[PDB]
Design a protein around this ligand. Structure first.
Ligand SMILES: *[C@@H]1O[C@H](CO)[C@@H](O)[C@H](O)[C@H]1NC(C)=O
Lengths: 49, 28
């Protein structure tokens, strides 16, 4: 094993849950976090955003 | 606007480059 300053390219299994829309919930997407009511959108992101 | 295509974790200290052959170049 070695870790360093750790510009990592390998990790083990990452967790997940079902998607709980329309409730106040404590959330993590891709490692970005907050608390809120998640809900469906008319907004049109670009494919990389 | 230019949009991201490729994003490579590789850790190198780049200081030179070359083309594999009109074609321009400008430094950020
Ligand atoms: C890049 O430069 C840094 C300067 O601190 C050095 O620690 C590192 O080993 C260098 N890496 C390569 C691949 O040259």
């Amino acid at each position: 094993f070695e870790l360093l300053h750790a510009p990592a390219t390998v990790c083990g299994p990452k967790k997940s849950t079902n998607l709980v829309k329309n409730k106040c919930v404590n959330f993590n997407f891709n490692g970005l976090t907050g608390t809120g009511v998640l809900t469906e959108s008319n907004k049109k992101f670009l494919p990389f955003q | 606007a230019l949009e991201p295509l490729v994003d490579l974790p590789i850790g190198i200290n780049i200081t030179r480059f070359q083309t594999l052959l009109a074609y321009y170049v400008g430094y950020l």
